[PDB]
Enzyme design. Structure first.
Site, PDB file in Angstrom:
ATOM      1  N   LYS A  16      -7.134  -0.614  -7.346  1.00 47.68           N
ATOM      2  CA  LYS A  16      -7.969   0.362  -6.651  1.00 47.68           C
ATOM      3  C   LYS A  16      -7.925   1.695  -7.408  1.00 47.68           C
ATOM      4  O   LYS A  16      -7.385   1.778  -8.515  1.00 47.68           O
ATOM      5  CB  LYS A  16      -7.519   0.507  -5.199  1.00 47.68           C
ATOM      6  N   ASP A  26      -6.189   8.685  -6.241  1.00 46.67           N
ATOM      7  CA  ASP A  26      -6.603   9.513  -5.113  1.00 46.67           C
ATOM      8  C   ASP A  26      -5.497  10.526  -4.859  1.00 46.67           C
ATOM      9  O   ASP A  26      -4.324  10.150  -4.747  1.00 46.67           O
ATOM     10  CB  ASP A  26      -6.886   8.624  -3.877  1.00 46.67           C
ATOM     11  N   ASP A  39      -9.773  14.119  -2.467  1.00 45.96           N
ATOM     12  CA  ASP A  39      -9.385  12.821  -3.004  1.00 45.96           C
ATOM     13  C   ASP A  39      -9.610  12.776  -4.514  1.00 45.96           C
ATOM     14  O   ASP A  39      -8.675  12.542  -5.293  1.00 45.96           O
ATOM     15  CB  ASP A  39     -10.168  11.735  -2.244  1.00 45.96           C
ATOM     16  N   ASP A  51     -10.788  18.200   2.447  1.00 48.96           N
ATOM     17  CA  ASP A  51     -10.513  18.171   3.880  1.00 48.96           C
ATOM     18  C   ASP A  51      -9.055  18.556   4.115  1.00 48.96           C
ATOM     19  O   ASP A  51      -8.268  18.679   3.173  1.00 48.96           O
ATOM     20  CB  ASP A  51     -10.854  16.794   4.489  1.00 48.96           C
ATOM     21  N   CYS A  58      -4.346  12.105  -2.363  1.00 46.97           N
ATOM     22  CA  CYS A  58      -3.418  12.047  -1.230  1.00 46.97           C
ATOM     23  C   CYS A  58      -2.212  11.158  -1.522  1.00 46.97           C
ATOM     24  O   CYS A  58      -1.155  11.351  -0.913  1.00 46.97           O
ATOM     25  CB  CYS A  58      -4.114  11.587   0.069  1.00 46.97           C
ATOM     26  N   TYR A  59      -2.328  10.218  -2.462  1.00 49.36           N
ATOM     27  CA  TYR A  59      -1.189   9.371  -2.808  1.00 49.36           C
ATOM     28  C   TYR A  59      -0.141  10.104  -3.634  1.00 49.36           C
ATOM     29  O   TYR A  59       0.939   9.550  -3.884  1.00 49.36           O
ATOM     30  CB  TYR A  59      -1.692   8.107  -3.535  1.00 49.36           C
ATOM     31  N   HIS A  98      -6.386  15.814   2.775  1.00 48.56           N
ATOM     32  CA  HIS A  98      -6.117  15.812   1.339  1.00 48.56           C
ATOM     33  C   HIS A  98      -5.507  17.129   0.878  1.00 48.56           C
ATOM     34  O   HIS A  98      -4.774  17.149  -0.116  1.00 48.56           O
ATOM     35  CB  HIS A  98      -7.389  15.492   0.552  1.00 48.56           C
ATOM     36  N   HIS A 124       0.841  -1.190   0.000  1.00 49.61           N
ATOM     37  CA  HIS A 124       0.000   0.000   0.000  1.00 49.61           C
ATOM     38  C   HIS A 124       0.879   1.244   0.000  1.00 49.61           C
ATOM     39  O   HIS A 124       1.944   1.270   0.626  1.00 49.61           O
ATOM     40  CB  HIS A 124      -0.942   0.035   1.224  1.00 49.61           C
ATOM     41  N   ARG A 157      -2.993   1.241  -4.209  1.00 49.99           N
ATOM     42  CA  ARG A 157      -2.680  -0.178  -4.373  1.00 49.99           C
ATOM     43  C   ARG A 157      -3.277  -0.674  -5.685  1.00 49.99           C
ATOM     44  O   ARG A 157      -4.195  -0.071  -6.248  1.00 49.99           O
ATOM     45  CB  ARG A 157      -3.165  -1.030  -3.175  1.00 49.99           C
TER      46      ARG A 157
HETATM   47  C1  LIG Z   1     -10.046  14.369   7.294  1.00 51.90           C
HETATM   48  C2  LIG Z   1     -10.331  12.854   7.208  1.00 51.90           C
HETATM   49  C3  LIG Z   1      -9.092  12.014   6.794  1.00 51.90           C
HETATM   50  C4  LIG Z   1      -9.398  10.525   6.614  1.00 51.90           C
HETATM   51  C5  LIG Z   1      -8.158   9.702   5.942  1.00 51.90           C
HETATM   52  C6  LIG Z   1      -6.919   9.936   6.758  1.00 51.90           C
HETATM   53  N1  LIG Z   1      -6.924   9.306   8.085  1.00 51.90           N
HETATM   54  C7  LIG Z   1      -6.066   9.783   9.165  1.00 51.90           C
HETATM   55  C8  LIG Z   1      -6.616  10.250  10.370  1.00 51.90           C
HETATM   56  C9  LIG Z   1      -5.762  10.690  11.389  1.00 51.90           C
HETATM   57  C10 LIG Z   1      -4.372  10.668  11.206  1.00 51.90           C
HETATM   58  C11 LIG Z   1      -3.824  10.202  10.002  1.00 51.90           C
HETATM   59  O1  LIG Z   1      -2.393  10.166   9.835  1.00 51.90           O
HETATM   60  C12 LIG Z   1      -1.864  10.268   8.499  1.00 51.90           C
HETATM   61  F1  LIG Z   1      -2.003   9.052   7.865  1.00 51.90           F
HETATM   62  F2  LIG Z   1      -0.537  10.634   8.553  1.00 51.90           F
HETATM   63  F3  LIG Z   1      -2.485  11.240   7.772  1.00 51.90           F
HETATM   64  C13 LIG Z   1      -4.685   9.748   8.996  1.00 51.90           C
HETATM   65  C14 LIG Z   1      -7.833   8.179   8.290  1.00 51.90           C
HETATM   66  O2  LIG Z   1      -7.899   7.605   9.350  1.00 51.90           O
HETATM   67  C15 LIG Z   1      -8.725   7.741   7.043  1.00 51.90           C
HETATM   68  N2  LIG Z   1      -8.407   8.352   5.844  1.00 51.90           N
HETATM   69  C16 LIG Z   1      -9.199   8.007   4.871  1.00 51.90           C
HETATM   70  C17 LIG Z   1      -8.460   8.107   3.479  1.00 51.90           C
HETATM   71  C18 LIG Z   1      -8.581   9.171   2.562  1.00 51.90           C
HETATM   72  N3  LIG Z   1      -7.806   8.892   1.514  1.00 51.90           N
HETATM   73  C19 LIG Z   1      -7.180   7.709   1.731  1.00 51.90           C
HETATM   74  N4  LIG Z   1      -7.608   7.246   2.958  1.00 51.90           N
HETATM   75  C20 LIG Z   1      -7.183   5.940   3.577  1.00 51.90           C
HETATM   76  C21 LIG Z   1      -6.319   6.168   4.836  1.00 51.90           C
HETATM   77  C22 LIG Z   1      -6.526   5.309   5.940  1.00 51.90           C
HETATM   78  C23 LIG Z   1      -5.766   5.468   7.093  1.00 51.90           C
HETATM   79  C24 LIG Z   1      -4.780   6.473   7.164  1.00 51.90           C
HETATM   80  F4  LIG Z   1      -4.043   6.587   8.314  1.00 51.90           F
HETATM   81  C25 LIG Z   1      -4.561   7.332   6.062  1.00 51.90           C
HETATM   82  C26 LIG Z   1      -5.331   7.182   4.895  1.00 51.90           C
HETATM   83  C1  LIG Z   2       2.758   8.724   8.813  1.00 51.01           C
HETATM   84  C2  LIG Z   2       1.462   7.955   8.573  1.00 51.01           C
HETATM   85  C3  LIG Z   2       0.429   7.872   9.700  1.00 51.01           C
HETATM   86  C4  LIG Z   2       1.279   7.368   7.403  1.00 51.01           C
HETATM   87  C5  LIG Z   2       0.024   6.551   7.032  1.00 51.01           C
HETATM   88  C6  LIG Z   2      -0.279   6.791   5.547  1.00 51.01           C
HETATM   89  C7  LIG Z   2      -1.449   6.005   4.941  1.00 51.01           C
HETATM   90  C8  LIG Z   2      -2.115   6.613   3.708  1.00 51.01           C
HETATM   91  C9  LIG Z   2      -1.883   4.837   5.400  1.00 51.01           C
HETATM   92  C10 LIG Z   2      -3.064   4.143   4.689  1.00 51.01           C
HETATM   93  C11 LIG Z   2      -3.648   3.036   5.560  1.00 51.01           C
HETATM   94  C12 LIG Z   2      -4.849   2.291   4.944  1.00 51.01           C
HETATM   95  C13 LIG Z   2      -5.452   1.165   5.783  1.00 51.01           C
HETATM   96  C14 LIG Z   2      -5.343   2.600   3.746  1.00 51.01           C
HETATM   97  C15 LIG Z   2      -6.545   1.895   3.084  1.00 51.01           C
HETATM   98  O1  LIG Z   2      -7.698   2.707   3.211  1.00 51.01           O
HETATM   99  P1  LIG Z   2      -8.845   2.789   2.012  1.00 51.01           P
HETATM  100  O2  LIG Z   2      -9.326   1.403   1.625  1.00 51.01           O
HETATM  101  O3  LIG Z   2      -9.982   3.662   2.494  1.00 51.01           O
HETATM  102  O4  LIG Z   2      -8.200   3.516   0.683  1.00 51.01           O
HETATM  103  P2  LIG Z   2      -7.619   2.827  -0.691  1.00 51.01           P
HETATM  104  O5  LIG Z   2      -8.787   2.307  -1.490  1.00 51.01           O
HETATM  105  O6  LIG Z   2      -6.961   3.993  -1.406  1.00 51.01           O
HETATM  106  O7  LIG Z   2      -6.597   1.759  -0.443  1.00 51.01           O
HETATM  107 ZN   LIG Z   3      -7.067  10.031   0.014  1.00 50.37          ZN
END
Ligand SMILES: CCCC[C@H]1CN(c2cccc(OC(F)(F)F)c2)C(=O)CN1Cc1cncn1Cc1ccc(F)cc1
Ligand SMILES: CC(C)=CCC/C(C)=C/CC/C(C)=C/COP(=O)(O)OP(=O)(O)O
Ligand SMILES: [Zn+2]
Ligand SMILES: O=S(=O)(O)C[C@H](O)CNC1CCCCC1
Ligand SMILES: O=S(=O)(O)C[C@H](O)CNC1CCCCC1
Ligand SMILES: O=S(=O)(O)C[C@H](O)CNC1CCCCC1
Lengths: 488, 318
Positions: A310, A313, A369, A376, A315-316, A379, A256, A307
Site C-alpha cells: 500500500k 502516509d 496524508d 485535517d 499518519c503512520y 493527520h 496493519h 501495510r
Molecule cells: C479527519 C478524518 C480522519 C479519518 C481517518 C481517521 N479515522 C478516525 C476517526 C475517529 C477516531 C479515530 O481514532 C484514531 F484512530 F485514534 F485516530 C480515527 C477514520 O475513521 C478514517 N481515517 C482514515 C485514514 C486516514 N489515514 C489513514 N486512514 C485509515 C484509518 C482508518 C481507521 C482509523 F481508526 C484510523 C485510520
Molecule cells: C488508538 C486507535 C483508535 C488506533 C487506531 C489506529 C489506526 C490507524 C487504525 C487503522 C484501521 C484501518 C482499518 C486502516 C485501513 O484504512 P485504509 O485502507 O483507508 O488505509 P491504508 O491504505 O493506509 O491501509
Molecule cells: Zn493517514
C-alpha cells in the site's frame, strides 16, 4: 549521529521495479512516487546551511499549523458531522498537537475543554463521543477524553481530575461490562472487538489505578494471537472452542500499522503486571522487522506505509514509527533474557514530514496524508507525534524504573476498586501494592536519551518530546498519573 | 422544502430533548437543521426507551446522515430484535448503504450482528456478496476482516463444506492472478492454507505450497508480499532455508521452480529480500562472517533506507 540515517536527497531515487508485470497496485504506487518525488525536487534540501534560491523552504510552519487548529475553539463546518461521534478525538488531536508545537492555552480555554469533556462522561461509567444525554460510552472516546484531561486539566476543583477520580469505580465497571471471556473487549455496548479497544482500555486503566486480575484475564492471549506471519498485528484474533479456554486463536486480517501500534503498546503495558506466566510472549524480532520494512524508499520520501504493497502516509509516522521504540525494547529484553545505530531512518522520516506532509505554504496550514490531500486534525496530530519520535531518541530505561520503585509510596492511594466477581481482585495488600508499584514505575520509565537528538533542518524545527505508549508529553503524564496514585 | 418534526402529526406527542454539552463547548459542529431535528427527537425516543416503527425510521434517517454514529446503530439493532423485524430485509438495506458509499466500522459491525443472529444454515450467498463487494476496493480492510470472521464463525458451527473451502481457494487464486501485489489476498491464502484449524498439513501440501510461493516470486521478483509469505511459511513449519537457496541465489547477483533463464525485464539486481534470505541461510549454516558481510552490503549499498537496522543485524553476528 546520522551515519546510518542517510538523507533522502543523498540517495538515488528509483521507482519500484515492475518485473514487466503491471497491476493496479503498481499503477497507484507509481503515481504516488511521481507525486512525492516531484515535491521533493521543488523543495530545498533541509540539510543545507543556506537554503537554495528558487526552491521551496521546508521549515516547519508552526504558526500556520497553530491557526489551522484554532477553529476547534470556535466551530467546525457542517461537513464535520461524520465526526460527531468522535468529538473527544477532535479535542485530543487539537490539544496534543498544541502541546507538541509548544503553544499554551489560557486557563479559560482549558476550563472550557475540561467542562465540555465532563459533559461526555456517563454516571454509569465511561466517556462517549459526545454528550452523555446523546451518546453511550465507548472505549475510544474514553482514551481520548482521559488523555485530553491530562493535557488540559489540573488538580483543583474545576480541573476535571477530581471528577475522574470519583468515576474510577464506574469506569472500571464499564470496562468489565465490555470484557469477553477470550480476552477481547467490545468497544461499546453491542460494538466491535479489536485491539484498538484493548489499547485504549489498558492506557486508561494504567493511568487511573484500576487494574485487577479479573480485568486482565486472557487479554495477553487475545493480543498475542493477533500477530501475523508478516510480523505485525491484525485487528483481532478468533477463539475456536475446544469441541475462556479456546482450542486455538487465529488472526483475522493483515498486519496493519494502526493495529500493530495498538498491539505492541498493549503488550508493553501488560509486561508491567506481576501475574504468573503473564503476559504470553510475542515475536518481538518479527515485529521489529515488519516495522522497519514499512519505511518507504527515497523516491517516496521516506514516510511509512501502513501495510505491505500500500501507499506511504504521514499518519503512520506515529502508528508505525512510534511503535519502533516499543519493539526495540522488547527485542532488547529478549536478548538480555538469553544472555547502537537507530533502527529506522530518523532523518528521512523528518524529511517526509517537512517536505511532503505539510500543507503548501500561505494556505490553511495543517498536515496531511500525502501531497494532493487536504490536511485535517488527525493527520496534523499523528504527523507531529511521529516527527517527535524521530527527533528525540526514546528508550525505556531500567535504571529509571528502578529509581521509580525506590521512591514509590505504597501507603498513598485512592480507594481500591471493588471487583465484580468475589475473587477477581488481588490476593492481598502485599500483592496489590506490588502491582501498583510496578505499573506506576514502568509507566514513568520512558526517557529521552541525552545526545540522541536529531533536528533535521535546524533547531527551529524542534517540537516537544512525546511519550511512547501513551502519546502525551512526559510533562503531562507525570503529574497526571501521580495524581491518581497519590504520589509526588 | 423541509417540514420540522414538531409540525408532523405522527410526532406530536413527543417533546424533543436538546443536546446537552454545556453553555460554550469546544469542537462544536454546525449541524444542518435536518440533523439537529432528528437527534433532538432521538434523544427523546431513547430517553423514554421507545421501541417502535417510527423510532426505527428515525434511526435510518440519522445513520444516512452520519453512518459512524455508533449510539444510533446500537439503538437500531435493539429495535430490530425487539420488534422481530425481518433481518433479511435489513441485510438488503445494508447492501444499498454500501452502494451509496455509506460506510464505517459501525455498518460493518451491524452486518456481522445480522449474520450472527440470522445464523443461516449455509452462508454461501453472503460469501458471494462479500466477494463482489471487493470490486471498488480490493484491499478494503474491514471487508477482509469480515470475510475471515464469516468463515471462522460458521466453520465453528460446522457449516463450511469441503466444496466451499475449495471454491474459496479458487477465488483467492484468481484474486492473486489479477493482482499478485494484493497483500490482503496473500493474507487470506495464509488463513485458507495454513492457519485455519481445518487446514491439511501433509508432505504433499507443503510441497504444493512451496511450489506456489516460488512460482509467485519468479513471476514478480520484487513483490514484498511473496517474500514475506515465503519467510513466514518456512519459519512457521521450521523448514530449513538452505535446500531452497538454488531458487533464490539468482536474485542475489532440485524440482522446485527456478527463475526464468533470462529474468523478466525491469528486474534490477540484487533483490534486497533475496540478500536477507542469503544472510539468514548463512546464519543457519553458522557462517556468521558470511552473514555479516551480506548485512553490511544491505546497510551500505543495496537497502540504504534501512542502513541502521541492517547494521544492527551485522553487529549481532559478533
Ligand atoms: C479527519 C478524518 C480522519 C479519518 C481517518 C481517521 N479515522 C478516525 C476517526 C475517529 C477516531 C479515530 O481514532 C484514531 F484512530 F485514534 F485516530 C480515527 C477514520 O475513521 C478514517 N481515517 C482514515 C485514514 C486516514 N489515514 C489513514 N486512514 C485509515 C484509518 C482508518 C481507521 C482509523 F481508526 C484510523 C485510520
Ligand atoms: C488508538 C486507535 C483508535 C488506533 C487506531 C489506529 C489506526 C490507524 C487504525 C487503522 C484501521 C484501518 C482499518 C486502516 C485501513 O484504512 P485504509 O485502507 O483507508 O488505509 P491504508 O491504505 O493506509 O491501509
Ligand atoms: Zn493517514
Ligand atoms: O510559516 S509560519 O512560520 O508558520 C508563519 C508565516 O511564515 C507568517 N509569515 C509572516 C509574514 C510577514 C511577517 C511576519 C511573518
Ligand atoms: O445514567 S446513565 O446511564 O449513566 C446516562 C444515561 O444512560 C444517558 N444515556 C443516553 C440517553 C440517550 C441516548 C444515548 C445514551
Ligand atoms: O539553531 S540552529 O540550528 O543552529 C539555526 C536556526 O534554528 C535556523 N532557523 C532558521 C532561521 C531563519 C528563519 C528560518 C529558520
Amino acid at each position: 549521529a546520522t551515519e546510518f540515517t542517510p538523507s533522502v536527497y543523498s540517495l538515488v531515487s528509483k521507482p519500484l521495479p515492475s518485473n514487466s508485470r503491471p497491476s493496479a497496485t503498481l499503477d497507484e504506487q507509481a503515481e504516488t512516487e511521481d507525486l512525492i518525488s516531484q515535491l521533493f525536487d521543488l523543495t530545498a534540501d533541509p540539510n543545507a546551511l543556506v537554503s537554495e534560491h528558487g526552491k521551496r523552504y521546508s521549515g516547519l510552519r508552526k504558526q500556520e499549523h497553530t491557526q489551522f487548529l484554532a477553529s476547534s475553539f470556535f466551530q467546525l463546518p457542517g461537513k464535520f458531522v461524520s465526526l460527531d461521534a468522535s468529538r473527544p478525538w477532535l479535542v485530543f488531536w487539537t490539544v496534543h498537537s498544541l502541546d507538541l508545537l509548544g503553544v499554551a492555552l489560557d486557563q479559560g480555554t482549558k476550563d472550557r475543554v475540561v467542562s465540555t469533556l465532563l459533559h461526555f462522561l456517563s454516571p454509569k461509567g465511561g466517556f462517549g463521543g459526545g454528550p452523555a444525554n446523546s451518546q453511550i460510552p465507548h472505549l475510544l472516546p474514553t482514551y481520548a477524553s482521559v488523555c485530553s484531561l491530562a493535557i488540559a486539566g489540573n488538580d483543583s476543583s474545576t480541573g476535571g481530575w477530581k471528577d475522574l477520580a470519583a468515576a474510577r469505580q464506574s469506569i472500571y465497571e464499564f470496562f468489565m461490562r465490555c470484557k469477553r471471556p477470550d480476552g477481547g473487549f467490545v468497544v461499546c455496548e453491542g460494538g466491535e472487538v479489536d485491539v484498538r479497544g484493548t489499547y485504549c482500555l489498558l492506557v486508561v486503566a494504567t493511568l487511573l489505578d484500576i487494574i485487577t486480575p479479573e480485568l486482565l484475564h486472557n487479554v495477553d492471549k487475545f493480543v498475542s494471537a493477533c500477530q501475523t506471519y508478516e510480523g505485525g498485528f491484525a485487528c483481532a484474533s478468533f477463539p475456536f472452542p475446544s469441541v475462556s479456554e479456546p482450542s486455538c486463536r487465529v488472526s483475522m486480517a493483515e498486519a496493519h500499522g494502526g493495529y500493530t501500534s495498538c498491539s505492541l503498546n498493549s503488550h508493553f503495558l501488560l509486561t508491567s503486571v506481576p501475574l504468573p506466566s503473564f503476559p504470553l510472549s510475542i515475536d518481538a524480532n518479527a515485529a521489529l522487522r515488519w516495522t522497519v520494512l514499512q519505511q518507504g524508499e527515497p523516491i517516496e520520501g521516506g514516510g511509512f506505509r501502513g501495510r505491505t504493497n500500500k501507499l506511504v502516509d504521514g499518519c503512520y509516522s506515529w502508528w508505525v514509527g512510534g511503535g519502533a521504540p516499543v519493539a526495540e525494547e522488547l527485542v532488547r529484553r529478549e536478548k538480555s533474557r538469553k544472555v547502537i545505530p537507530p533502527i529506522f531512518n530518523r532523518v528521512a522520516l523528518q524529511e517526509f514530514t517537512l517536505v511532503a506532509a505539510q500543507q503548501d505554504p500561505g494556505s490553511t496550514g495543517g498536515l496531511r496524508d500525502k501531497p494532493g490531500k487536504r490536511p485535517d486534525q488527525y493527520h496534523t496530530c499523528n504527523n507531529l507525534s511521529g516527527l517527535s519520535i524521530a527527533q528525540h531518541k526514546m528508550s525505556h530505561s531500567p535504571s529509571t524504573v528502578s529509581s521509580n520503585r525506590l521512591k514509590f509510596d505504597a501507603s498513598k492511594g485512592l480507594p481500591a476498586v471493588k471487583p465484580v466477581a468475589p475473587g477477581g481482585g488481588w490476593k492481598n495488600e502485599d500483592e496489590r501494592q506490588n502491582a501498583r508499584r510496578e505499573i506506576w514505575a514502568n509507566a514513568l520509565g520512558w526517557i529521552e536519551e541525552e545526545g540522541g537528538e536529531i533536528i533535521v533542518g535546524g533547531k527551529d524545527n524542534r517540537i516537544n518530546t512525546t511519550t511512547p505508549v501513551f502519546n502525551i508529553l512526559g510533562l503531562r503524564l507525570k503529574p497526571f498519573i501521580n495524581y491518581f496514585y497519590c504520589q509526588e | 422544502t423541509y417540514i420540522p418534526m414538531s409540525q408532523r402529526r405522527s410526532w406530536a406527542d413527543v417533546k424533543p430533548i436538546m443536546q446537552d454539552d454545556g453553555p460554550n463547548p469546544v469542537v462544536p459542529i454546525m449541524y444542518s437543521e435536518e440533523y439537529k431535528d432528528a437527534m433532538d427527537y432521538f434523544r427523546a425516543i431513547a430517553a423514554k426507551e421507545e421501541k417502535s416503527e417510527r423510532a426505527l425510521e428515525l434511526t435510518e434517517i440519522i445513520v444516512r446522515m452520519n453512518p459512524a454514529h455508533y449510539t444510533v446503530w446500537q439503538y437500531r439493532f435493539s429495535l430490530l430484535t425487539s420488534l422481530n423485524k425481518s433481518l433479511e430485509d435489513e441485510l438488503r438495506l445494508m447492501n444499498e448503504f454500501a452502494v451509496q458509499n455509506l460506510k464505517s466500522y459501525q455498518v460493518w459491525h451491524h452486518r456481522l450482528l445480522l449474520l450472527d443472529r440470522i445464523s443461516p444454515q449455509d452462508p454461501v450467498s453472503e460469501i458471494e456478496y462479500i466477494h463482489g463487494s471487493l470490486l471498488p476496493d480490493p484491499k478494503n480492510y474491514h471487508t477482509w476482516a469480515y470475510l475471515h470472521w464469516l468463515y471462522s464463525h460458521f466453520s465453528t458451527l460446522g457449516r463450511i463444506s469441503e466444496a466451499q473451502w475449495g471454491s474459496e481457494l479458487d477465488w483467492c487464486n484468481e484474486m492473486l492472478r489479477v493482482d499478485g501485489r494484493n497483500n490482503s489476498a496473500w493474507g487470506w491464502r495464509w488463513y485458507l492454507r495454513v492457519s485455519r484449524p481445518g487446514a491439511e498439513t501433509s508432505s504433499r501440501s507443503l510441497q504444493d505450497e512451496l511450489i506456489y510461493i516460488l512460482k509467485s516470486i519468479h513471476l514478480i521478483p520484487h513483490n514484498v508480499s511473496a517474500w514475506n509469505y515465503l519467510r513466514g511459511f518456512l519459519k512457521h513449519f521450521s523448514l530449513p532455508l538452505v535446500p531452497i537457496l538454488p531458487a533464490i541465489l539468482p536474485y542475489t547477483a532440485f524440482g522446485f521452480p527456478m527463475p526464468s533463464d533470462p529474468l523478466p525485464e525491469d528486474t534490477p539486481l540484487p533483490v534486497p529480500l533475496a540478500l536477507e534470505y542469503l544472510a539468514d541461510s548463512f546464519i543457519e549454516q553458522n557462517r556468521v562472517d558470511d552473514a555479516a558481510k551480506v548485512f553490511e552490503k544491505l546497510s551500505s549499498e543495496y537497502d540504504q533506507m534501512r542502513a541502521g537496522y541492517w547494521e544492527f543485524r551485522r553487529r549481532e553476528c559478533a
